[PDB]
PDB file of C-alpha atoms in Angstrom:
ATOM      1  CA  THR A   2     -73.094  27.858  68.197  1.00 53.94           C
ATOM      2  CA  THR A   3     -74.178  25.048  65.862  1.00 53.67           C
ATOM      3  CA  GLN A   4     -71.967  23.531  63.199  1.00 53.77           C
ATOM      4  CA  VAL A   5     -72.042  25.330  59.841  1.00 51.11           C
ATOM      5  CA  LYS A   6     -75.367  24.683  58.096  1.00 48.32           C
ATOM      6  CA  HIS A   7     -76.311  25.235  54.453  1.00 46.51           C
ATOM      7  CA  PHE A   8     -79.352  26.757  52.770  1.00 51.47           C
ATOM      8  CA  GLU A   9     -80.079  26.866  49.039  1.00 53.66           C
ATOM      9  CA  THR A  10     -83.079  27.302  46.747  1.00 56.91           C
ATOM     10  CA  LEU A  11     -84.069  28.740  43.381  1.00 52.82           C
ATOM     11  CA  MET A  12     -86.032  31.945  43.891  1.00 55.43           C
ATOM     12  CA  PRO A  13     -89.700  32.527  42.923  1.00 58.05           C
ATOM     13  CA  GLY A  14     -90.870  35.534  40.892  1.00 58.13           C
ATOM     14  CA  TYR A  15     -91.160  39.252  41.733  1.00 57.06           C
ATOM     15  CA  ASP A  16     -94.464  38.665  43.491  1.00 57.62           C
ATOM     16  CA  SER A  17     -93.175  36.186  46.070  1.00 56.46           C
ATOM     17  CA  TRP A  18     -91.023  35.771  49.167  1.00 56.98           C
ATOM     18  CA  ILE A  19     -89.206  32.924  50.833  1.00 55.69           C
ATOM     19  CA  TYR A  20     -89.278  32.811  54.655  1.00 55.21           C
ATOM     20  CA  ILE A  21     -86.421  30.958  56.354  1.00 57.49           C
ATOM     21  CA  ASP A  22     -86.425  29.458  59.835  1.00 56.05           C
ATOM     22  CA  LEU A  23     -82.703  29.493  60.566  1.00 57.55           C
ATOM     23  CA  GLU A  24     -83.077  27.088  63.509  1.00 57.35           C
ATOM     24  CA  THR A  25     -84.652  24.273  61.452  1.00 56.87           C
ATOM     25  CA  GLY A  26     -83.282  25.182  58.012  1.00 54.50           C
ATOM     26  CA  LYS A  27     -86.842  24.956  56.642  1.00 52.39           C
ATOM     27  CA  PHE A  28     -88.498  27.593  54.470  1.00 49.51           C
ATOM     28  CA  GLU A  29     -91.936  28.539  53.166  1.00 47.24           C
ATOM     29  CA  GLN A  30     -92.864  30.436  49.999  1.00 47.24           C
ATOM     30  CA  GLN A  31     -95.569  33.128  50.065  1.00 50.41           C
ATOM     31  CA  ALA A  32     -96.756  36.018  47.833  1.00 49.37           C
ATOM     32  CA  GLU A  33     -96.278  39.640  48.812  1.00 49.90           C
ATOM     33  CA  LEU A  34     -99.590  40.358  50.509  1.00 51.41           C
ATOM     34  CA  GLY A  35     -99.417  44.160  50.666  1.00 53.10           C
ATOM     35  CA  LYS A  36    -101.497  46.583  48.621  1.00 51.92           C
ATOM     36  CA  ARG A  37    -100.001  47.384  45.224  1.00 50.81           C
ATOM     37  CA  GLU A  38     -99.626  50.699  43.400  1.00 50.41           C
ATOM     38  CA  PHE A  39     -99.096  50.663  39.641  1.00 50.49           C
ATOM     39  CA  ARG A  40     -96.757  53.522  38.862  1.00 51.18           C
ATOM     40  CA  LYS A  41     -96.048  55.061  35.445  1.00 51.18           C
ATOM     41  CA  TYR A  42     -92.620  56.725  35.334  1.00 51.04           C
ATOM     42  CA  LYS A  43     -91.987  59.852  33.227  1.00 52.53           C
ATOM     43  CA  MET A  45     -86.730  57.799  32.664  1.00 49.64           C
ATOM     44  CA  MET A  46     -85.329  56.419  35.966  1.00 51.89           C
ATOM     45  CA  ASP A  47     -86.697  59.560  37.628  1.00 49.99           C
ATOM     46  CA  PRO A  48     -88.618  59.162  40.948  1.00 46.49           C
ATOM     47  CA  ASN A  49     -91.437  61.216  39.380  1.00 44.26           C
ATOM     48  CA  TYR A  50     -94.481  59.091  38.534  1.00 44.14           C
ATOM     49  CA  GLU A  51     -98.277  59.051  38.171  1.00 41.80           C
ATOM     50  CA  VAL A  52    -100.433  56.393  39.853  1.00 43.39           C
ATOM     51  CA  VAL A  53    -102.310  54.462  37.159  1.00 46.06           C
ATOM     52  CA  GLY A  54    -103.756  51.578  39.206  1.00 44.90           C
ATOM     53  CA  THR A  55    -104.113  49.819  42.549  1.00 45.06           C
ATOM     54  CA  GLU A  56    -104.867  46.347  43.812  1.00 47.69           C
ATOM     55  CA  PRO A  57    -105.916  45.892  47.478  1.00 51.68           C
ATOM     56  CA  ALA A  58    -103.813  43.831  49.892  1.00 48.59           C
ATOM     57  CA  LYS A  59    -104.430  40.076  49.727  1.00 49.82           C
ATOM     58  CA  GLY A  60    -103.588  39.605  53.424  1.00 48.73           C
ATOM     59  CA  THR A  61    -101.828  41.034  56.489  1.00 47.96           C
ATOM     60  CA  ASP A  62     -98.781  40.272  58.649  1.00 48.63           C
ATOM     61  CA  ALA A  63    -101.044  37.844  60.540  1.00 50.08           C
ATOM     62  CA  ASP A  64    -100.934  35.640  57.420  1.00 52.35           C
ATOM     63  CA  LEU A  65     -97.102  35.434  57.413  1.00 54.23           C
ATOM     64  CA  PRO A  66     -95.475  31.993  58.017  1.00 53.36           C
ATOM     65  CA  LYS A  67     -95.370  31.087  61.674  1.00 53.19           C
ATOM     66  CA  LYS A  68     -91.648  30.550  62.203  1.00 56.26           C
ATOM     67  CA  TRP A  69     -89.067  32.550  60.261  1.00 59.12           C
ATOM     68  CA  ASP A  70     -85.966  34.659  60.954  1.00 61.00           C
ATOM     69  CA  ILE A  71     -85.023  36.126  57.556  1.00 61.59           C
ATOM     70  CA  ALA A  72     -86.807  36.466  54.213  1.00 65.00           C
ATOM     71  CA  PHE A  73     -85.869  37.090  50.582  1.00 63.68           C
ATOM     72  CA  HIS A  74     -87.663  38.677  47.639  1.00 66.15           C
ATOM     73  CA  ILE A  75     -85.429  38.376  44.572  1.00 69.70           C
ATOM     74  CA  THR A  76     -82.386  39.996  46.246  1.00 70.29           C
ATOM     75  CA  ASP A  77     -84.241  42.134  48.800  1.00 71.15           C
ATOM     76  CA  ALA A  78     -83.877  41.011  52.430  1.00 73.68           C
ATOM     77  CA  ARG A  79     -86.097  41.346  55.504  1.00 74.22           C
ATOM     78  CA  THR A  80     -85.674  40.096  59.072  1.00 75.53           C
ATOM     79  CA  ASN A  81     -88.185  39.019  61.701  1.00 71.18           C
ATOM     80  CA  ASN A  82     -87.354  41.689  64.298  1.00 67.93           C
ATOM     81  CA  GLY A  83     -83.584  41.489  63.664  1.00 66.51           C
ATOM     82  CA  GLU A  84     -80.560  43.797  63.460  1.00 68.02           C
ATOM     83  CA  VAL A  85     -77.769  43.209  60.942  1.00 72.33           C
ATOM     84  CA  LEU A  86     -74.074  44.079  60.727  1.00 72.63           C
ATOM     85  CA  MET A  87     -71.947  43.235  57.698  1.00 70.95           C
ATOM     86  CA  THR A  88     -68.684  42.290  59.452  1.00 70.31           C
ATOM     87  CA  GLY A  89     -65.158  42.390  57.994  1.00 68.23           C
ATOM     88  CA  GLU A  90     -64.728  38.611  58.466  1.00 67.41           C
ATOM     89  CA  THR A  91     -64.921  36.469  55.322  1.00 71.19           C
ATOM     90  CA  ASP A  92     -64.186  33.071  56.883  1.00 68.70           C
ATOM     91  CA  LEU A  93     -67.207  31.596  58.661  1.00 68.71           C
ATOM     92  CA  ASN A  94     -64.920  29.125  60.440  1.00 69.27           C
ATOM     93  CA  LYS A  95     -62.978  31.960  62.035  1.00 71.44           C
ATOM     94  CA  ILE A  96     -65.989  33.350  63.939  1.00 70.67           C
ATOM     95  CA  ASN A  97     -68.396  31.877  66.510  1.00 69.86           C
ATOM     96  CA  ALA A  98     -69.919  34.886  68.257  1.00 68.68           C
ATOM     97  CA  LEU A  99     -71.366  38.242  67.170  1.00 68.21           C
ATOM     98  CA  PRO A 100     -68.886  41.172  67.394  1.00 70.05           C
ATOM     99  CA  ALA A 101     -69.732  44.658  68.651  1.00 68.82           C
ATOM    100  CA  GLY A 102     -70.614  47.290  66.043  1.00 67.12           C
ATOM    101  CA  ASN A 103     -73.445  49.202  64.385  1.00 66.52           C
ATOM    102  CA  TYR A 104     -76.341  46.811  63.843  1.00 64.56           C
ATOM    103  CA  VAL A 105     -79.028  47.928  61.363  1.00 68.46           C
ATOM    104  CA  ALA A 106     -82.799  47.432  61.889  1.00 66.75           C
ATOM    105  CA  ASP A 107     -85.359  46.952  59.089  1.00 66.77           C
ATOM    106  CA  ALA A 108     -86.758  50.198  57.656  1.00 65.16           C
ATOM    107  CA  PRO A 109     -89.683  51.100  55.297  1.00 66.18           C
ATOM    108  CA  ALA A 110     -88.929  50.360  51.635  1.00 66.18           C
ATOM    109  CA  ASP A 111     -90.782  49.731  48.377  1.00 63.48           C
ATOM    110  CA  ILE A 112     -90.244  46.483  46.468  1.00 63.79           C
ATOM    111  CA  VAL A 113     -91.072  45.583  42.870  1.00 63.20           C
ATOM    112  CA  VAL A 114     -93.886  42.994  42.747  1.00 64.41           C
ATOM    113  CA  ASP A 115     -94.816  43.224  39.037  1.00 61.38           C
ATOM    114  CA  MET A 116     -92.459  44.185  36.229  1.00 57.35           C
ATOM    115  CA  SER A 117     -94.481  42.818  33.309  1.00 60.33           C
ATOM    116  CA  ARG A 118     -95.555  46.266  32.058  1.00 62.55           C
ATOM    117  CA  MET A 119     -92.186  47.992  32.418  1.00 65.18           C
ATOM    118  CA  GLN A 120     -91.096  47.410  28.799  1.00 65.91           C
ATOM    119  CA  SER A 121     -94.510  48.032  27.252  1.00 64.93           C
ATOM    120  CA  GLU A 122     -95.577  51.056  29.310  1.00 67.30           C
ATOM    121  CA  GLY A 123     -92.862  52.051  31.802  1.00 71.53           C
ATOM    122  CA  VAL A 124     -95.191  50.912  34.609  1.00 71.88           C
ATOM    123  CA  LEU A 125     -94.229  49.009  37.767  1.00 68.24           C
ATOM    124  CA  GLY A 126     -96.290  47.398  40.510  1.00 69.32           C
ATOM    125  CA  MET A 127     -94.710  48.504  43.801  1.00 68.27           C
ATOM    126  CA  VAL A 128     -95.520  47.516  47.401  1.00 71.67           C
ATOM    127  CA  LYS A 129     -94.513  49.460  50.513  1.00 71.78           C
ATOM    128  CA  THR A 130     -92.961  46.979  52.956  1.00 71.67           C
ATOM    129  CA  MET A 131     -89.951  46.643  55.309  1.00 70.95           C
ATOM    130  CA  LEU A 132     -86.424  45.732  54.190  1.00 73.71           C
ATOM    131  CA  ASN A 133     -83.085  45.425  55.967  1.00 73.28           C
ATOM    132  CA  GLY A 134     -80.601  47.683  54.185  1.00 73.45           C
ATOM    133  CA  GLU A 135     -77.471  46.026  55.616  1.00 74.02           C
ATOM    134  CA  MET A 136     -78.393  42.448  54.768  1.00 70.33           C
ATOM    135  CA  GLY A 137     -79.364  43.817  51.339  1.00 75.80           C
ATOM    136  CA  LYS A 138     -75.621  44.261  50.742  1.00 74.82           C
ATOM    137  CA  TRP A 139     -75.175  40.492  50.297  1.00 70.81           C
ATOM    138  CA  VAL A 140     -75.070  41.264  46.568  1.00 75.21           C
ATOM    139  CA  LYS A 141     -73.260  44.326  45.235  1.00 71.46           C
ATOM    140  CA  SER A 142     -74.393  45.909  41.991  1.00 76.39           C
ATOM    141  CA  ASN A 143     -71.703  46.077  39.326  1.00 72.92           C
ATOM    142  CA  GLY A 144     -73.935  48.747  37.703  1.00 75.22           C
ATOM    143  CA  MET A 145     -77.320  48.294  35.964  1.00 75.63           C
ATOM    144  CA  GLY A 146     -77.629  45.812  33.113  1.00 71.33           C
ATOM    145  CA  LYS A 147     -74.887  43.686  34.652  1.00 68.88           C
ATOM    146  CA  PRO A 148     -74.878  40.533  36.857  1.00 69.83           C
ATOM    147  CA  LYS A 149     -74.489  41.453  40.527  1.00 71.81           C
ATOM    148  CA  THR A 150     -71.724  39.929  42.681  1.00 71.04           C
ATOM    149  CA  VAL A 151     -72.226  38.027  45.921  1.00 71.23           C
ATOM    150  CA  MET A 152     -70.205  39.584  48.747  1.00 74.30           C
ATOM    151  CA  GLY A 153     -68.035  37.288  50.836  1.00 72.60           C
ATOM    152  CA  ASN A 154     -68.515  39.016  54.190  1.00 72.95           C
ATOM    153  CA  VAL A 155     -70.050  37.239  57.154  1.00 73.00           C
ATOM    154  CA  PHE A 156     -73.252  38.999  58.218  1.00 72.90           C
ATOM    155  CA  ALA A 157     -74.070  39.084  61.947  1.00 71.13           C
ATOM    156  CA  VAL A 158     -77.777  39.029  62.946  1.00 70.11           C
ATOM    157  CA  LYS A 159     -79.217  39.672  66.455  1.00 71.76           C
ATOM    158  CA  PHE A 160     -82.902  38.869  67.046  1.00 71.01           C
ATOM    159  CA  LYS A 161     -85.210  40.435  69.671  1.00 68.18           C
ATOM    160  CA  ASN A 162     -85.915  36.891  70.895  1.00 69.47           C
ATOM    161  CA  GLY A 163     -82.240  36.465  71.794  1.00 69.31           C
ATOM    162  CA  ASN A 164     -81.209  34.094  69.014  1.00 72.06           C
ATOM    163  CA  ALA A 165     -78.446  35.115  66.638  1.00 72.76           C
ATOM    164  CA  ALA A 166     -76.795  34.006  63.399  1.00 69.67           C
ATOM    165  CA  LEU A 167     -73.625  34.348  61.337  1.00 69.79           C
ATOM    166  CA  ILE A 168     -74.290  34.073  57.603  1.00 70.33           C
ATOM    167  CA  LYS A 169     -71.994  33.923  54.574  1.00 72.18           C
ATOM    168  CA  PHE A 170     -73.677  34.101  51.148  1.00 71.78           C
ATOM    169  CA  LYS A 171     -72.603  31.731  48.357  1.00 68.72           C
ATOM    170  CA  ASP A 172     -74.705  32.271  45.187  1.00 70.80           C
ATOM    171  CA  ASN A 173     -77.433  34.526  43.719  1.00 67.91           C
ATOM    172  CA  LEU A 174     -77.807  32.483  40.511  1.00 66.60           C
ATOM    173  CA  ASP A 175     -78.275  28.839  39.494  1.00 67.53           C
ATOM    174  CA  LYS A 176     -75.649  26.826  37.595  1.00 67.26           C
ATOM    175  CA  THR A 177     -76.771  28.210  34.194  1.00 66.82           C
ATOM    176  CA  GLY A 178     -76.462  31.772  35.501  1.00 67.09           C
ATOM    177  CA  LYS A 179     -79.936  32.511  34.102  1.00 62.77           C
ATOM    178  CA  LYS A 180     -82.206  31.856  37.118  1.00 64.23           C
ATOM    179  CA  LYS A 181     -82.199  33.744  40.447  1.00 66.77           C
ATOM    180  CA  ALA A 182     -81.314  31.907  43.679  1.00 66.49           C
ATOM    181  CA  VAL A 183     -80.363  32.421  47.327  1.00 69.54           C
ATOM    182  CA  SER A 184     -77.601  30.209  48.770  1.00 71.59           C
ATOM    183  CA  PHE A 185     -75.588  30.631  52.006  1.00 69.17           C
ATOM    184  CA  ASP A 186     -73.805  28.907  54.876  1.00 72.22           C
ATOM    185  CA  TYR A 187     -74.544  29.882  58.454  1.00 73.22           C
ATOM    186  CA  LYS A 188     -74.156  29.198  62.141  1.00 73.29           C
ATOM    187  CA  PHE A 189     -77.180  29.462  64.410  1.00 75.64           C
ATOM    188  CA  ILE A 190     -76.710  30.715  67.982  1.00 74.15           C
ATOM    189  CA  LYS A 191     -79.654  29.730  70.167  1.00 77.14           C
ATOM    190  CA  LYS A 192     -80.441  31.994  73.135  1.00 76.41           C
ATOM    191  CA  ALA A 193     -78.864  30.186  76.091  1.00 77.50           C
TER     192      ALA A 193
END
């Protein structure tokens, strides 16, 4: 288990991801590459008509070479990882992954384009993979309200045998106007 490391960055827009290599602390930015569906919604109902499509601009082969976890706004994805939101809130009081119910990534739609939501009630959506558990790093206070960063340490097991313990710090910049992802973490290299 490494010392505690830190990661922080201001987030890009709805059409982009950051990909974090937890081992090196480095990240790369990249657009969502998946095919898009423009959906017109009849009032927060899941009933919609398809009004447009743009083809995919790439495939998973185009993804950055080395990454463990990834963020799109507040959505989270792992590179073949399983996540458990533990009950621990002090990252200094934990140095190994506990037993429990670890959650794999599952199919999910993300919002890639929200520019025509006000004018038309249309959203560009892409079908991708998200990790539902890690997604809990921010808790909604209800719509139209700033979310709150949860204090819990998240445990992450990777297929490759590495692991991490992550505690989120911030989802906004200092002004509180711009999105961000900030956390402290310990990396546990497969021995």
